């Protein structure tokens, strides 16, 4: 199982980022996908969940209405549109096949400042 | 250990006339060799209790499970994973009898033990989360139910395969959770997913010349044992929508694959 994250960067409060997760080495379209984050001095938090086809989506209470998870099964890619970014959202973001972060890549850094 | 593997095999076939005297005679030997308070006695009491539960002998099943629990707590320890397996079997037993309030603390104790000892990532944690969500939804407590399901689903598809029977069982339970909440479209989505995965495993990847059963059902309208209850429940969902030609296509498939909604909660044992 190979997952690679991208799309992180430095934005100001209220800004947007779009995270990408390139998947290979497994039947991606048969798996539910997860977005997990780890803030500088906190433990790993679950952010979002998407079913195989994308008809079922779930979000962490603090990101509901601001974040949108999607997927392109033909491209074997997972997405996370992050709007109205707040300082609390500043973390290292990973994609995974579970909430614990099993099979996660190197992640992508999200920074919310000034 | 060989004997423990032999009984489950006889029980799976429904040979209760052979499985019950096997457990009873094994328990007779063990109680003369190492007494009553021994782990192998509690193991046999646990398996026989599950055999009794399948025979609707719930009084007997509860008695043996409570006995096996006291033995396992003494002989193995209060935080041993085998104690959590028996606590789970007691919770499932109470749950199958409608005693959801009494079943919930036993389920929570089993989850706490399995998270602490095996880690939050283990398939036995997904087993407990699934059972907890089942006991919670049947009480009308939906607060964390969907969270437990998506947590258990992640563990199951990762540790085992997305084709593993526990994945389809947890998915059917979440779809039943959607039905109780009137989330008919989300239940439809989940039942379609199970059937798509079952179609892809056998007939291959979806295209124009190879479509799952539900796709062919929607075309006509325009003009594993878990799959049978998936075919019936999705058929009932089409009937509710007034899509009778789509409902007939699934009922025809459910009849061929065998030989309001179907209320069957999939509790995961031990």
Q: Which domains does chain B have, with CATH numbers?
A: 1-270 (1.25.40.10)
Sequence-distant contacts of B254-261: CB under 8 A, at least 24 apart: B254/B228, B257/B227, B257/B228, B257/B231, B258/B228, B260/B236, B261/B176, B261/B179, B261/B233, B261/B236
3-state secondary structure of A78: strand
| Interface-testing mutation among B122, B125, B157, B202, with chain A (most A C-beta atoms within 10 A) | B157
CA end-to-end span of chain B: 16
- Is B165 in contact with B224 (CB distance < 8 Å)? yes
Give the gap in angstroms from C-alpha A26 to the nearest C-alpha of chain B: 11
Beta-bridge mates of residue A110: A9, A91
Instruction: Judge: A56–B190 Cβ closer than 8 Å, yes or no.
Output: yes
Task: Please indicate if any CB of chain B lies within 8 Å of the CB of A56.
Answer: yes
Cβ neighbourhood burial of B146 (10 Å; 0-12, 13-18, 19+): buried
Rounded to the nearest angstrom, the minimum Cα separation between A39 and chain B is 20
Residue B68 has which token pair? 């096996």
What Å distances lie between residue B170 and B12, B72, B125, B167, B173, CA to CA?
21, 28, 13, 5, 5
Nearest Cβ partner for B158 among A27, A46, A98: A98
Rounded to 5 degrees, φ, ψ at A81 are -80, 120
Picking from B244, B149, B221, B131, the residue whose alpha carbon sits closest to that of residue B187 is B149
Which residues does residue A46 pair with via DSSP β-bridges, in sequence order?
A36
Residue B154's nearest CA partner among B116, B121, B192 is: B121
Can you list the positions of beta strands (E) in chain B?
none
| Both structure tokens of B64 | 């043996």
Chain A interface test: which of B162, B163, B168, B212 (most A C-beta within 10 Å): B162
Decide if B193 and A27 are in contact by the 8 Å CB cutoff. no
Say whether B243 sits in a helix, a strand or coil: coil
Asked if B154 lies within 8 A of A99 by C-beta distance, the reply is yes
**Tokens 């065998």 — which residue?**
B258
Q: Give whole-number Cα distances, B177 to B56, B207, B220, in Å.
A: 25, 31, 29
B193: nearest CB among A49, A52, A103: A52
Task: Output Rg (C-alpha) for chain A, integer angstroms.
Answer: 13
Write out chain B residues lying below 8 Å of A52, CB-based.
193, 196-197
DSSP B193-258: HHHHHHHHHHT-S-BTTB--HHHHHHHHHH--HHHHHHHHHHHHHHHHTT-HHHHHHHHHHHHHHH
- The tokens for B155 are 């563990």
CB contact under 8 A, A97 and B121: no
Helix axes B225-240 and B244-258, enclosed angle (nearest 10): 160
Name which of B269, B224, B262, B217 is nearest B244 in CA terms.
B217
Per the CB < 8 A criterion, the answer to whether B162 and B197 are in contact is yes
Token digits for B95?
């749950």
End-to-end Cα, chain A, rounded Å: 38
Count the Cβ atoms, other than its own, within 10 Å of residue B98: 10
Strand A108-112 with A9-11, pairing: parallel
Query: Does residue A33 sit at the B interface (CB-CB below 8 Å)?
Result: no
Tokens linked to B101 = 């309030």
Q: Structure tokens of B265? A: 């909660």
Measured CA to CA, the distance from residue A93 to residue A60 in angstroms comes to: 14
Whose tokens are 């009849």? That residue is B255
Residue A88 is given by DSSP the state G
Tell me which of B121, B154, B163, B184 to substitute to probe the interface with A (most A C-beta atoms closer than 10 Å).
Answer: B154
Nearest alpha carbon to residue A33 among A66, A73, A74, A88: A73
A30 chain-B contacts, CB cut-off 8 A: 157, 162-163, 197, 200
Q: Does A99 touch chain B (CB under 8 A)?
A: yes
**Resolution for this experimental structure (Å):** 2.3
Q: What are phi and psi of A108, to 5 degrees?
A: -140, 135
In chain A, residues with a C-beta closer than 8 Å to the C-beta of B163 are 30
Q: Are B71 and B39 in contact (CB under 8 A)?
A: yes
Tell me which H or E stretch contains B57.
none
B115 to chain A, any CB pair closer than 8 A? The answer is no
Tell me whether residues B158 and A97 touch, CB distance under 8 A.
yes
A26 touches chain B (CB under 8 A): no
Interface of B with A in 183-222 (CB under 8 A): 186, 189-190, 192-193, 196-197, 200
Contact B236, B218 (CB under 8 A): no
Nearest C-alpha neighbor of B169 from the set B267, B261, B78, B90: B267
Method: X-ray
Sign, Cα dihedral of B123, B125, B130, B135: positive
Nearest CA in chain B to A100: B121
DSSP of A32-77: -EEEEEE-TTS--EEEEEE-SSSS-EEE-TTTTTTEEEEEETTTTE
| Residue in A49, A23, A82 with CA at minimum distance from that of residue B186 | A49
CB burial string A1-10: b at 16+ within 10 A, e below: eebebebbee
DSSP B71-131: HHHHHT-TT-HHHHHHHHHHHHHHHHTT-HHHHHHHHHHHHHHHHHHH-TTSHHHHHHHHH
- Count of Cβ atoms closer than 10 Å to residue B247 Cβ: 20
CA A83 to chain centre: 13
Q: Within 10 Å of residue B109's Cβ, how many Cβ atoms?
A: 19
Query: Using CB atoms and an 8 Å cut-off, which of residues 117-146 of chain B contact chain A?
Result: 120-121, 146
């Amino acid at each position: 199982v190979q997952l690679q994250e991208s799309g992180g960067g430095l934005v100001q409060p209220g800004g947007s980022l779009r995270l990408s997760c390139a998947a290979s080495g497994f039947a991606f379209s048969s798996y539910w996908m997860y977005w997990v984050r780890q803030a500088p001095e906190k433990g790993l938090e679950w952010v979002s969940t998407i079913n195989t086809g994308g008809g079922i989506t779930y979000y962490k209470d603090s990101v509901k209405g601001r974040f949108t998870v999607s997927r392109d099964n033909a491209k074997n890619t997972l997405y996370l549109q992050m709007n109205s970014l707040k300082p609390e959202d500043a973390a290292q973001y990973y994609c995974a096949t579970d909430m614990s972060g099993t099979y996660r890549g190197q992640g992508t850094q999200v920074t919310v400042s000034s | 250990r060989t004997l423990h593997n032999l009984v489950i095999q006889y029980a799976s076939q429904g040979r209760y006339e052979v499985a019950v005297p096997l457990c009873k005679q094994a328990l007779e030997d063990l109680e003369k060799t190492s007494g009553h308070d021994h782990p192998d006695v509690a193991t046999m009491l646990n398996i026989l209790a599950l055999v009794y539960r399948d025979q609707n002998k719930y009084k007997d099943a509860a008695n043996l499970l409570n006995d096996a629990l006291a033995i396992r707590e003494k002989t193995l320890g209060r935080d041993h994973p085998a104690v959590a397996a028996t606590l789970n079997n007691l919770a499932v037993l109470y749950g199958k009898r409608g005693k959801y309030k009494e079943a919930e603390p036993l389920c929570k104790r089993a989850l706490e033990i399995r998270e602490k000892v095996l880690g939050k990532d283990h398939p036995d944690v997904a087993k407990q989360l699934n059972n907890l969500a089942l006991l919670c939804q049947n009480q009308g407590k939906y607060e964390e139910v969907e969270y437990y399901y998506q947590r258990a689903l992640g563990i199951y598809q990762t540790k085992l395969g997305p084709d593993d029977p526990n994945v389809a069982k947890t998915k059917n339970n979440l779809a039943s959770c959607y039905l109780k909440q009137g989330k008919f479209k989300q239940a439809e989505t989940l039942y379609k997913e199970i059937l798509t995965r079952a179609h892809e495993r056998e007939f291959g990847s979806v295209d124009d010349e190879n479509k799952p059963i539900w796709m062919h059902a929607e075309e006509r309208e325009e003009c594993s044992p878990t799959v049978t209850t998936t075919l019936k429940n999705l058929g009932a969902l089409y009937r509710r929508q007034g899509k009778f030609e789509a409902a007939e296509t699934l009922e025809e498939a459910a009849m061929r694959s065998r030989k309001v909604f179907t209320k069957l909660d999939y509790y995961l044992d031990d």
